[PDB]
Design a protein around this ligand. Structure first.
Ligand SMILES: [Zn+2]
Length: 431
């Protein structure tokens, strides 16, 4: 039993890991590379796709399922396992990815083919390949998200996939992994813990009552997959005290994902499920409105507050959010609320630098609106949570994370008495 990193080595995108055991080949995830690494979705995998026996998907995000259609486009015809939640989500993530992409490295025939091989595998359901035993464990990072437990040849391996931030309320807490000979894990935030969730929410609510009470606009850059709906859920459970104002989810994509949420009730936390039982959708605060097209999206830039706006991209690469920022950053009464850390060098960071102006969409924009960064809405387990999850685990190979962040985690694990390594691309590791 060996596991071979084929993505997310000293980096956060590309997640794909080949497990060689029981005389079988099981591919754990198959995401694409993003941002600067995008061109690498064109390069080859590094293994023979036609030789793969089965595929397991930890969650529906593009950096975990994105290259799947390339796997089929290049031969593979085996089954692809994933929870029903990921199965349903995947279709929206993929269909959207096909429509949005400069140089697509796969076509509609591939997505179609890729989706046709999906087979439901729920938490605690065992898959039998050769003499290898596989099961999904609750990861709490996305509806239907999981980590992989693989046993065979008298040994146990655990592929964490992405672990969630247990302090939040939407998803159920990540399960502890069983004791394993080897643990391949992420370390997105191996360098630091997140600000507590409760105090992050209270701050969010103050910023909201403040700017809305003065007829101002609250601009919120958000990820369409699961960050948008979480903000909506916070707006819902606190709608009674917030000043009345429309909430524009300015994202067709976030809209599609949101419509799907009622079909996934079982994949949420107890708290969320209890709300649904009372017969009410807690992901739709009063006043929500899903803006479908450009014309209405731009009308908002010219319309007066009070209002709350959710738009992407979540890191300001592109999206409708830029347009909102362009016309709203100049008014001191508005407020920009980041609900996720902005990458260094990106426009976000540049904004947080709080200079006199910022270049957005070809023009220079005065920056008067207030700025707040609530890193506490993070979807990944922070360093402290990463440590508790990894406790008592003998050997650990880190993936998914910048080198520095991964190292900061390895140090602590090493001082704790655990054998740690930083996965290298192509270089398999023995379970
Ligand atoms: Zn990931």
């Amino acid at each position: 039993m060996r596991i071979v990193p084929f993505g997310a080595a000293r980096e956060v995108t590309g997640s794909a890991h080949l497990l060689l055991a029981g005389g079988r080949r099981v591919l754990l995830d198959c995401g694409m590379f993003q941002g600067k690494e995008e061109a690498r979705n064109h390069a080859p995998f590094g293994f023979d796709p036609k030789e793969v026996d089965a595929v397991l998907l930890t969650h529906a995000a593009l950096d975990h399922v994105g290259r799947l259609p390339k796997l089929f486009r290049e031969g593979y015809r085996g089954p692809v396992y994933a929870t029903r939640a990921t199965v349903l989500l995947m279709e929206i993530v993929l269909e959207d990815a096909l429509k949005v992409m400069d140089e697509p490295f796969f076509g509609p025939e591939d997505v179609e083919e890729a989706l046709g091989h999906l087979r439901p595998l729920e938490y605690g359901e065992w898959l039998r390949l050769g003499a290898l035993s596989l099961a999904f464990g609750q990861a709490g990072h996305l509806p239907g998200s999981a980590f992989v437990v693989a046993q065979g040849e008298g040994r146990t391996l655990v592929y964490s996939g992405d672990l969630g931030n247990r302090e939040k309320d939407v998803l159920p807490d990540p399960s502890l992994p069983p004791l394993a000979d080897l643990v391949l894990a992420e370390g997105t935030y191996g360098d630091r813990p997140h600000r507590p969730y409760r105090e992050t929410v209270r701050e969010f609510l103050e910023i909201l009552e403040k700017t809305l009470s003065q007829g101002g606009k609250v601009l919120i850059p958000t990820f369409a997959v699961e960050r948008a709906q979480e903000i909506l859920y916070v707006l819902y459970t606190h709608g009674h005290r917030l000043p009345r104002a429309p909430i524009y989810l300015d994202s067709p994509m976030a809209g599609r994902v949101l419509s799907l949420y009622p079909r996934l009730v079982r994949y949420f936390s107890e708290e969320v499920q209890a709300h649904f039982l009372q017969g009410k959708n807690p992901f739709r605060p009063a006043g929500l409105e899903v803006v479908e097209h450009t014309e209405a999206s731009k009308a908002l830039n010219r319309a007066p507050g009070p209002m709350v706006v959710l738009a992407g991209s979540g890191m300001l690469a592109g999206g409708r959010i830029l347009h909102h920022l362009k016309h709203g950053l100049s008014d001191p009464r508005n407020a920009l609320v980041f609900v996720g850390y902005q990458p260094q060098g990106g426009l976000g960071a540049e904004i947080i630098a709080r200079p006199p102006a910022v270049r957005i969409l070809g023009e220079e924009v005065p920056l008067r609106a207030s700025v707040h960064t609530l890193g506490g809405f993070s979807g990944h387990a922070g360093q402290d949570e990463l440590l508790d999850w990894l406790q008592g685990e003998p050997r650990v190979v880190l993936v998914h994370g910048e080198e520095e962040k991964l190292l900061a985690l390895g140090k602590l694990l090493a001082l704790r008495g655990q054998e740690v390594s930083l996965a290298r691309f192509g270089e398999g590791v023995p379970v």
